[PDB]
Amino acid sequence: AVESTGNAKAEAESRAEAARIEGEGSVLQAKLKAQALAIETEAELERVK
Amino acid sequence: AVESTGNAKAEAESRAEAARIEGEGSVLQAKLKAQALAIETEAELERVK
Numbered sequence A, B: 001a002v003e004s005t006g007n008a009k010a011e012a013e014s015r016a017e018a019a020r021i022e023g024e025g026s027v028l029q030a031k032l033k034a035q036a037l038a039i040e041t042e043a044e045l046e047r048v049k
Helices: A002-048 B002-048
Strands: none
Touching: A002 B002
């Protein structure tokens, strides 16, 4: 019981870790993507104007 | 009886463990996904506006 629960807990917490780093990393990368799209669509809107 | 119930209990608790880590991990990852979709659709709604 301790063995199977141990390994399953290990793989599961591994997925939780990957999910967390993917989480915050998605947050920051989406934020820089937000600034990028913002400045790009801004200059684009200007010159197109 | 103790043997079969023991092994079945082990595998079952293993599934419970995986279900729990999948649970909270789904919670946190869905939350970061929520912030990501929020900021992304926010900046998107702005520039599109």
